[PDB]
Amino acid sequence: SMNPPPPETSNPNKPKRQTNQLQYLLRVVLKTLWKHQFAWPFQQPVDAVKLNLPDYYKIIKTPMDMGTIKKRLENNYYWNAQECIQDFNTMFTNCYIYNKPGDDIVLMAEALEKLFLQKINELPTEE
Ligand SMILES: CC(=O)NCCCCn1c2c(c3ccccc31)C(=O)NCC2
């Protein structure tokens, strides 16, 4: 029923790159999803305490959220686009794994994931 530490957003000994696909992931993908009317449940780690979800971190062992992803992008945590794409997919999958099918939160994730897929379909070829 307690919150775990959040996912890592800083690690000096992880090698890093700043690149055109990662720049698109920030400027196009993350920013598109972040501004959406259904983004708010996804903008920070799940607070299982305040939200009264004592089983959340029993079920979800790979937490991920857009606040973490935004920090990772802005703070140059990633080596490649696939790492970031994986974080988005983990976020969506967690939502579908935890929640009751058909609930509002699932519909919210689906709306964001539709846009995610639309944007990553046009991920640029690397420079
Ligand atoms: C991103 C994520 O999966 N968070 C965990 C659930 C957070 C609490 N919560 C819920 C619903 C919901 C809807 C909107 C915000 C928070 C919500 C809803 O539809 N079913 C009940 C749970």
CA of 79 to the centre of ligand 1 (A): 31
Across 15-35, b (16+ Cβ under 10 Å) vs e yields eeeebebbebbbeebbeebbe
In the block, tokens 């997919």 appear at: 89
The verdict on the CB of residue 41 being under 6 Å from ligand 1 is: yes
- Work out the angle between the directed axes of helices 104-120 and 81-98 (0-180°, nearest 10): 160
Q: Residue 106 in 3-state DSSP?
A: helix
The verdict on the CB of residue 66 being under 6 Å from ligand 1 is: no
Give the determination technique: X-ray
Which residue has its alpha carbon closest to ligand 1 atom 16? 41
What's the resolution in A?
Answer: 0.9
Residue 31's nearest CA partner among 3, 73, 93 is: 73
Domains of the chain (ranges; CATH) run 19-123 (1.20.920.10)
The verdict on the CB of residue 55 being under 6 Å from ligand 1 is: no
In contact, 71 and 7? CB cutoff 8 Å? no
